[PDB]
Design a protein around this ligand. Structure first.
Ligand SMILES: Brc1cncc(-c2nn[nH]n2)c1
Ligand SMILES: Brc1cncc(-c2nn[nH]n2)c1
Lengths: 258, 251
């Protein structure tokens, strides 16, 4: 079912670098589509079954989900060299896309990306699934008006500057900690792909959060949208909103502002 | 702050019995006269009992929902009283038993729907009720039910609550499942003639509550989802509410 014939895949150019190897773009010639554009995650040292098991674990998680704003798993090739076939997001990483398009993208498009992300996260919340790594780096751009959530293997597991205080202090990951992370991610989107807490040491971050310090309101930001992020950044997890509420709030923001 | 002057409260007839004392119906005059429920506290001269009793009011001030009992105020001077919105038709379990041959399936599905909307609101505020049963539901009118009791029910509890005292949003889903069964069973208690200690043994063996007579198999399909052994497999209230809404319209 998930096992794909290698001869149906035609490997193309290297589009990125991953945890286990190089990510490539390619073509999948199935009975349906003459040439579907795909992304091929490769694995360098996958002759070792321990590495193999770790690499293939992403595909095991991936098959459970089906959502328009989550990267779709097309298949796997378990014979060496081991490959993971995923739907291609041609425009690449969100961080990079936002940096490049800083003086072209409107606020309506920025709010749209957050909305789309909040729909994927609400779907994951419905499946009682905890992502553990919501960041602009783990978001892919399919088109000018479509973003997807990727990275379900936990590449950086340390993103201290995105983590909720209880994750830093006690390694507690819940639906509430995912909300905090989404808050930081909405800040990064409005900050046009700028990393949070620049020139601040990781060990000094928790000290600041505990003292009530937060990320400033971006220059191009509706105060109503910043009001929403500050709700995600409540110290007490039980006080943070859920993704069904954030989804609904971003809908009104999308309309009222632009 | 909800502190009310006692001269603004006129006590009436006893409408029920509560955890700390007797529940009465009454009148609250404000700048127009309003029918209220007065929760009383028998031994509230003791500050430990007082603190426990007044904790219900502290919990309640946080919520505002059409299907959740509203807190009108409190009287902290002795005798201590908690003023709440009146639900004239009383307890749900009793109302269902009485009207066993006077309620249609559409009304039964409606109560579950209304109950799922209140629970979805609580889930949004990241609140865990810990006691979802038809006994803690109040009847305002023939087509309006309210969630009450915000202060050991082995037959309603999820296996992880019995085995490890673990209470989460997933355990609340299990309890709502049992509550939907009670509603369709016209207020009949779950697992009759089964000892509390023998309940967990049955649940662990995959045993569940039977499909009530003349219950839509689609609705029973929904309860069985609430009764998944693994909490992570159970649906959330936002899904249940959406599902109950379609089942209701189909009826
Ligand atoms: Br999975 C995946 C899908 N589509 C594009 C990418 C990707 N492009 N550039 N870096 N990563 C990854
Ligand atoms: Br609180 C509350 C509100 N409205 C009715 C009651 C009640 N009636 N009978 N038992 N309890 C309680």
């Amino acid at each position: 079912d998930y096992e794909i014939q290698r001869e149906r895949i035609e490997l193309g150019r290297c589009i990125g670098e991953g945890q286990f190897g190089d990510v490539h773009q390619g073509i999948y010639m199935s009975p349906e589509n003459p040439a579907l554009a795909v992304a091929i995650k490769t694995c360098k040292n996958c002759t070792s079954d321990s590495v193999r098991e770790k690499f293939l674990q992403e595909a095991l998680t991936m098959r459970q989900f089906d959502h328009p704003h989550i990267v779709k798993l097309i298949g796997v090739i378990t014979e060496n060299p081991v490959w993971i076939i995923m739907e291609l997001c041609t425009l690449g990483e969100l961080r990079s896309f936002l940096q490049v398009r800083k003086y072209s993208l409107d606020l309506a498009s920025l709010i749209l990306y957050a909305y789309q992300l909040s729909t994927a996260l609400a779907y994951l919340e419905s499946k009682r699934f905890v992502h553990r790594d919501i960041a602009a780096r783990n978001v892919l751009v399919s088109s000018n008006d479509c973003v997807k959530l990727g990275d379900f293997g936990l590449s950086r597991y340390l993103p201290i500057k995105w983590m909720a205080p209880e994750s830093i202090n006690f390694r507690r990951f819940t639906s509430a900690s995912d909300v905090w992370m989404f808050g930081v991610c909405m800040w990064e989107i409005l900050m046009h792909g700028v990393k949070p807490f620049q020139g601040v040491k990781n060990n000094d971050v928790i000290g600041r959060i505990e003292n009530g310090e937060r990320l400033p309101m971006p220059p191009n930001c509706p105060p109503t949208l910043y009001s929403l992020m500050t709700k995600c950044w409540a110290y007490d997890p039980s006080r943070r909103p859920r993704f069904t509420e954030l989804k609904a709030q971003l809908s009104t923001i999308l309309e009222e502002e632009k």
